[PDB]
Amino acid sequence: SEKEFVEHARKAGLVIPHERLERPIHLACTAGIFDAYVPPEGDARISSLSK
């Protein structure tokens, strides 16, 4: 007569086990783009001109 349900799933961000990582996360890439080239405002009208 006594039995209960299980499995209530949760996501808990907690900094302590995140620090205790024994093999720190290896990244192939960096998320941002350092310096963003900001192009000429007339770049549509200089495209029809080759040289």
Binding site: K11, A12, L14, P17, R20, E22, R23, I25, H26, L27
Partner: protein, 206 residues
Amino acid sequence: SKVTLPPNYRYGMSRPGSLSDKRKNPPGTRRRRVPVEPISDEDWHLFCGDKVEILEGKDAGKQGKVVQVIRQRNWVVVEGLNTHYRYVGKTVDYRGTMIPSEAPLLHNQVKLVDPTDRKPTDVEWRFTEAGERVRVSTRSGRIIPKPEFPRADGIVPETWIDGPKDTSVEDALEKTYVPRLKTLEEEVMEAMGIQETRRHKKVYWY
């Protein structure tokens, strides 16, 4: 601290005392035993930090540094080589930061590479004449070093600065001992000049 694991247990690369683990395998979990090829600790030729070649998987013929070994399941981790992709940051509106992550390898799919010609080789434990135990290559006939590696603390002994409650190397290694036949009690009581006269009456033991 020593956490005692249940007799039947699976090893998920997650540190057995951690929330990732308690969440993966809760108090009452008993799963099917994964058959593991028994290896005596003296037959184990793979440590952390040594360059190795991968014989299997989608990434093969490559070479990488071993980060972590899991001995209970016979596993190696070659950083950023054996790979599958996983999101880390999460909230309801935001799935953040897809990160490449490493799937572990059996020790059959990874061979140790000797430094000189950068080929994969069969390592065999040998005793030399100096009382030393080193790994010797079967194919190339050379000895392979052992991978000196940092430690879990992230504390390098060479660069260090003593805080208030740290004792200096000088005072720690200093030998004050005069190996004489009195106990701690007699020594200290004599040194503090505490003077006691009376003696204990007879006691019966049983």
